[PDB]
Amino acid sequence: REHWATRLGLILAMAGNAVGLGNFLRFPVQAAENGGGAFMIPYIIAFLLVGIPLMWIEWAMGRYGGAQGHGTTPAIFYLLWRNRFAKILGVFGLWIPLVVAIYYVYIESWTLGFAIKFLVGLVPEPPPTDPDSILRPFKEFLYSYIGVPKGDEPILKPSLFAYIVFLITMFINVSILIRGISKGIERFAKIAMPTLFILAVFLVIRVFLLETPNGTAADGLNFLWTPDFEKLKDPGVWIAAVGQIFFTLSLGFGAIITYASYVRKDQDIVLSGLTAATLNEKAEVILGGSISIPAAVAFFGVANAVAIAKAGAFNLGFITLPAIFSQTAGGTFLGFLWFFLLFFAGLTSSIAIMQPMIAFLEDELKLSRKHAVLWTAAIVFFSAHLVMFLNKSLDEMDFWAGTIGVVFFGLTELIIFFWIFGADKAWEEINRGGIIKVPRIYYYVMRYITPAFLAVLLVVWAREYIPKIMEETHWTVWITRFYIIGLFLFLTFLVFLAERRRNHESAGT
Amino acid sequence: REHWATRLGLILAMAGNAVGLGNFLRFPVQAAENGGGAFMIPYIIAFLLVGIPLMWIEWAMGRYGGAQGHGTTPAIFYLLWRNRFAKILGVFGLWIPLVVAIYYVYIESWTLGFAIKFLVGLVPEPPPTDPDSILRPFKEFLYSYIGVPKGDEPILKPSLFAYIVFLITMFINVSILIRGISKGIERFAKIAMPTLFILAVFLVIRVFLLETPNGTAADGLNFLWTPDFEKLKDPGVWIAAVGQIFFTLSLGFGAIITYASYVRKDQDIVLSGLTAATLNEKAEVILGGSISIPAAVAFFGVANAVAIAKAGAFNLGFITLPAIFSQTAGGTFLGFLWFFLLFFAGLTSSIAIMQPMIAFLEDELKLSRKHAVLWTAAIVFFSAHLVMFLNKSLDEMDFWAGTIGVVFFGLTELIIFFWIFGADKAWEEINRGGIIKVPRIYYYVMRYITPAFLAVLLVVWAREYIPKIMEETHWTVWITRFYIIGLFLFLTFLVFLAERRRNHESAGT
Numbered sequence A, B: 001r002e003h004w005a006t007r008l009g010l011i012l013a014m015a016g017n018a019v020g021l022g023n024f025l026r027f028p029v030q031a032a033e034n035g036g037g038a039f040m041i042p043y044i045i046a047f048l049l050v051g052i053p054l055m056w057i058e059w060a061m062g063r064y065g066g067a068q069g070h071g072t073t074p075a076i077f078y079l080l081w082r083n084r085f086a087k088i089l090g091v092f093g094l095w096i097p098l099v100v101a102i103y104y105v106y107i108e109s110w111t112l113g114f115a116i117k118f119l120v121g122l123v124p125e126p127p128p129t130d131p132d133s134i135l136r137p138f139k140e141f142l143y144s145y146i147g148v149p150k151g152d153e154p155i156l157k158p159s160l161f162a163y164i165v166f167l168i169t170m171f172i173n174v175s176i177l178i179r180g181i182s183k184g185i186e187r188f189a190k191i192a193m194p195t196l197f198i199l200a201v202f203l204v205i206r207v208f209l210l211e212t213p214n215g216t217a218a219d220g221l222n223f224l225w226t227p228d229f230e231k232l233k234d235p236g237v238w239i240a241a242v243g244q245i246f247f248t249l250s251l252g253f254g255a256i257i258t259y260a261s262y263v264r265k266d267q268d269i270v271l272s273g274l275t276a277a278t279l280n281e282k283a284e285v286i287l288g289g290s291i292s293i294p295a296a297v298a299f300f301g302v303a304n305a306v307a308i309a310k311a312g313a314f315n316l317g318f319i320t321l322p323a324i325f326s327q328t329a330g331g332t333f334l335g336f337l338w339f340f341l342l343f344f345a346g347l348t349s350s351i352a353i354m355q356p357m358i359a360f361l362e363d364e365l366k367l368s369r370k371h372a373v374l375w376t377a378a379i380v381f382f383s384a385h386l387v388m389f390l391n392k393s394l395d396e397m398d399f400w401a402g403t404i405g406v407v408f409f410g411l412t413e414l415i416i417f418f419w420i421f422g423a424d425k426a427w428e429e430i431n432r433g434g435i436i437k438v439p440r441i442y443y444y445v446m447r448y449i450t451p452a453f454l455a456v457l458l459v460v461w462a463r464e465y466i467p468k469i470m471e472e473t474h475w476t477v478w479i480t481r482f483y484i485i486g487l488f489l490f491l492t493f494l495v496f497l498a499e500r501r502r503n504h505e506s507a508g509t
């Protein structure tokens, strides 16, 4: 089996798995939509009661499986729980990252296409004070790129440029993955993460210099970092905060598990896992939090900044920020640096969510790395046509896989490891080889608090939120539901084939 | 490998593969849409220049593959042509029958549901002369069963009854297939084919007694059997005639090939193949041709009968015929006998188009028959939800797979066997073990006339017909296109896995 070559390499690869579009695009919107500082308390609490303990659990399950030649959850769950149902529940750790990759790589491709156009100055020209006259050209630019519907049909028509850039983006992901863990992912992380850090710091500095008649970047920071204890009682804020913690730490996607499956059996995961998690959190709250929101607030004031965030997932990052930058000297190049940052952040994460399918095909069906990578890319490339052409298909996938799925899977993996496999065995396994030990209090957090917290969350979710989504959506949501259900049945079939191959092989040995 | 147990068994199974909904539903519409007797000359000529020679070619390829343990075209094409492209072209002999099964089993399920309701008398009551007042209730009955759209959305809503009957129909197909070739398919054919023949003869007799002020059944027969040489120049009629010959003989679906793969290496296929073909043709032109058209013509006259046929694929068989029968004593029970006939005709054919996927999984991935059958049923059952809920998805599948695909595949398989593998080797292989020999003239028909006839047909098709279909259809056709393209990529992946398994096994031996 492959292994990470260096400690630093492992840490930066895991940090790049985590630090992605979630930090720079998703966090500012979630924080802004949910009251700024009012979001931050539930967020910090979720980091402590869910993010940290689940991070250690995933690293441990991955390292444990990897020791036996298995890096993905159909096999790993079965190692932990010798029951046919383990293998079926395990399919979610292939299905979730595959479905997420299907829309995530497309959005990543937009950042590359925007980086290219901004570099070469093929960008809109706003009319030199009316905000709408400045924003409209950037709205039109995004809408033309991805091809937002102008009529009643729920159909998208991406530009030829966007489509070619998607192909290029898939090629770049493949170019890294095909080189494998140490020579591909790890080597890339050592270049990409320092680059990303420097680009991000530069942009934070530039933004901190923004001052207009409507405010300063300081006003943005104050909005994000001033607590509002009256919102601690709002379930929606808690649900938002927990969903963001899963998404941002890559938990419940089978991706931390698969990366950790390349950690040597004896090598520490306590300090390493904690470090990757903290690095992500710094990039999220310090870097991601200090760019878009303070820029928007400086230019528009808090109330308008908030309304922009609520407006769409992509408004702040693909329309508003470049529009604001366009009002400054060098602003087109600053937009380039922003999209380049987003691109490296996305790329280091998308390789992490394609690696589970790759590991499964290699570990369980015994494909060569080359074939595993190319068939993985083929399935993602083909499937992404749904997200490219069907309006809101992206939203539907992000909901089932990237929102509900990961929380369900996090609870599942915790129950399997800490309850079924055995709490003391799990605890022992997490701590084995640790440079530090997990604080004792965390045993009770993992065994009782985390699953209870998650279980309640899912119930309140399913009761007061999802009913309005199974009944109040356009009929075309069933196109995406049908297809991703088919993907699950497909992956289940592959796990069935893997077991038949194993059986036929055991009979020959 | 399994083998057919008896000569008669083999013949009736192959006759039941052929004799299906194509004979009783499709033929009358095609003949009626294309001038009755004006259709019949091109049809008879296509039977001689395409149907017969391709039937022998498929039996021979199947028997040839079966001798080496292979019943499906990815492997068989590769045996005939040791080239990677053979295996890829061979995927069409899994994809075509799977896609066709996906809509064909659903339509078969309607015949079972109608048989049930007609048996129990849960049928419409027409108002005792106005044709519309008699037809409308039967139109409404079909539209409620399958759930035709009442608004603008291209969405179907089948009744709960129709949905349960689809499940039952899948179960019945599975119940036969899971017993295998000799104890399942062959044993069923020995019961079903005589039943079908007797039901069909009874219905022809009953219809021949129809006389109304608008005409007699005799008028229907005269319309169908009176040549119109002025239509011999119409390409559309030729295209219609050839498409019907493929569909009705099950050619180009990989299904005759797979059945023939269970014929012993030494056993005759010349007389056997010819007999199955002739039996189908009698059931088509004598039985299928003498029921619906003469009934409709007797009641409505030729011009109206023709207009009914042009009205929809299903109007004549599911609306008009039962409406006409309802005007006669015992007419509800006669409708039962009609739908029961259609059900046995469909069932004996649907098992034939599921068997290729089953044979592939058994032969190439080494699944047990039980697992091959159940996974096949699962994929068909799941996929059929597209045809059940998306208006016109059925039409799109029937076009790409059941219309264009089979003609393309017929030409492909002929080129592979007779040109690449070798005309003299092919000829030798067809005739080996024959109780009779193929007439010498047919060597030149197979080598030159058949491929030339097909090639011209496809060109004239692609030039003067398909352009109007890639540009003049509703956007939702891309939902079905996307999904069936995904099915091809899926089957290609399975052929890739089969080759890797074979490779790993050869290295162990």
Ligand SMILES: CCCCCCCCO[C@@H]1O[C@H](CO)[C@@H](O)[C@H](O)[C@H]1O
Residues within 6 Å of the ligand: A157, A158, A159, A160, A161, A163, A381, A382, A385
């Ligand atoms: C591998 C799956 C292929 C399914 C069909 C893909 C069709 C892609 O179609 C392409 O779309 C681009 C973006 O809109 C257009 O700019 C191009 O002109 C068009 O060829």
Ligand SMILES: CCCCCCCCO[C@@H]1O[C@H](CO)[C@@H](O)[C@H](O)[C@H]1O
Residues within 6 Å of the ligand: A116, A160, A161, A164, A165, A168
């Ligand atoms: C990495 C570089 C990818 C380049 C893809 C080129 C796509 C060209 O796309 C074409 O460009 C023309 C000129 O702008 C436009 O007028 C056309 O509408 C557009 O189709």
Ligand SMILES: CCCCCCCCO[C@@H]1O[C@H](CO)[C@@H](O)[C@H](O)[C@H]1O
Residues within 6 Å of the ligand: A156, A157, A158, A385, A386, A389, A390, B478, B479, B482
């Ligand atoms: C379910 C996902 C399948 C999407 C396949 C879409 C195939 C491409 O479809 C083509 O796209 C072009 C670019 O928009 C259009 O200009 C063409 O009119 C259209 O034929």
Ligand SMILES: CCCCCCCCO[C@@H]1O[C@H](CO)[C@@H](O)[C@H](O)[C@H]1O
Residues within 6 Å of the ligand: A048, A049, A438, A439, A440, A441, A442, A445
């Ligand atoms: C919500 C959970 C937050 C846990 C923060 C743990 C901080 C560390 O807590 C420390 O743990 C050590 C090891 O068990 C003990 O020896 C120390 O006395 C204790 O203070």
Ligand SMILES: CCCCCCCCO[C@@H]1O[C@H](CO)[C@@H](O)[C@H](O)[C@H]1O
Residues within 6 Å of the ligand: A469, A470, A471, A472, A473, A474, A475, A476, A477, A478, A479, B155, B156, B386, B389, B390, B479
């Ligand atoms: C491609 C096949 C599409 C068929 C699905 C048709 C079912 C439409 O049903 C609709 O589904 C929506 C989404 O759940 C709901 O919001 C609506 O209440 C419901 O009427």
Ligand SMILES: CCCCCCCCO[C@@H]1O[C@H](CO)[C@@H](O)[C@H](O)[C@H]1O
Residues within 6 Å of the ligand: B157, B158, B159, B160, B161, B163, B381, B382, B385
């Ligand atoms: C295996 C793939 C499952 C995808 C969702 C299938 C949903 C079937 O839904 C069923 O449809 C029937 C027919 O309209 C309705 O009568 C039933 O009330 C409904 O439960």
Ligand SMILES: CCCCCCCCO[C@@H]1O[C@H](CO)[C@@H](O)[C@H](O)[C@H]1O
Residues within 6 Å of the ligand: B116, B160, B161, B164, B165, B168
């Ligand atoms: C093989 C027998 C299958 C029987 C399936 C029963 C489906 C019942 O279906 C129900 O039947 C009621 C009474 O007719 C109707 O009023 C309801 O609308 C319908 O949903």
Ligand SMILES: CCCCCCCCO[C@@H]1O[C@H](CO)[C@@H](O)[C@H](O)[C@H]1O
Residues within 6 Å of the ligand: A478, A479, A482, B156, B157, B158, B385, B386, B389, B390
């Ligand atoms: C692409 C094929 C997917 C189709 C899945 C449809 C899932 C079922 O959808 C359900 O169907 C019922 C019966 O029509 C409706 O009454 C319900 O409103 C709808 O939710």
Ligand SMILES: CCCCCCCCO[C@@H]1O[C@H](CO)[C@@H](O)[C@H](O)[C@H]1O
Residues within 6 Å of the ligand: B048, B049, B438, B439, B440, B441, B442, B445
């Ligand atoms: C369109 C093709 C129709 C072919 C009909 C063939 C009828 C049989 O033709 C016969 O074939 C025998 C064997 O070669 C010869 O010995 C006979 O002389 C010949 O008449």
Ligand SMILES: CCCCCCCCO[C@@H]1O[C@H](CO)[C@@H](O)[C@H](O)[C@H]1O
Residues within 6 Å of the ligand: A155, A156, A386, A389, A390, A479, B469, B470, B471, B472, B473, B474, B475, B476, B477, B478, B479
């Ligand atoms: C589920 C994803 C659907 C996206 C497909 C959108 C492409 C629509 O494009 C349309 O396609 C039709 C069918 O070929 C053609 O008749 C029209 O000319 C064309 O505009």
Ligand SMILES: CCCCCCCCO[C@H]1O[C@H](CO)[C@@H](O)[C@H](O)[C@@H]1O
Residues within 6 Å of the ligand: A021, A022, A025, A026, A104, A107, A311, A312, A313, A314, A392, A394, A395, A398
């Ligand atoms: C940042 C990592 C991926 C995030 C995917 C977010 C998916 C949901 O985001 C959605 O939010 C807005 C809601 O009005 C819409 O305007 C957008 O179309 C978008 O699909």
Ligand SMILES: CCCCCCCCO[C@H]1O[C@H](CO)[C@@H](O)[C@H](O)[C@@H]1O
Residues within 6 Å of the ligand: B021, B022, B025, B026, B104, B107, B311, B312, B313, B314, B392, B394, B395, B398
């Ligand atoms: C008989 C074996 C399967 C035949 C499938 C036929 C598919 C095309 O048949 C179509 O023809 C008519 C055209 O107006 C439509 O009314 C129907 O909805 C039907 O889909």
Ligand SMILES: CC(C)C[C@H](N)C(=O)O
Residues within 6 Å of the ligand: A017, A018, A019, A020, A021, A022, A023, A100, A247, A248, A249, A250, A253, A255, A349, A350, A352, A353
């Ligand atoms: C799905 C994950 C790889 C996403 C990543 N953690 C991010 O924040 O963008």
Ligand SMILES: CC(C)C[C@H](N)C(=O)O
Residues within 6 Å of the ligand: B017, B018, B019, B020, B021, B022, B023, B100, B247, B248, B249, B250, B253, B255, B349, B350, B352, B353
């Ligand atoms: C697809 C084939 C099995 C159809 C069959 N030959 C019929 O006439 O209905």
Ligand code: NA
Residues within 6 Å of the ligand: A018, A019, A020, A022, A023, A247, A248, A249, A250, A280, A284
């Ligand atoms: Na992150």
Ligand code: NA
Residues within 6 Å of the ligand: A015, A016, A017, A018, A019, A020, A021, A344, A345, A346, A347, A348, A349, A350
């Ligand atoms: Na990343």
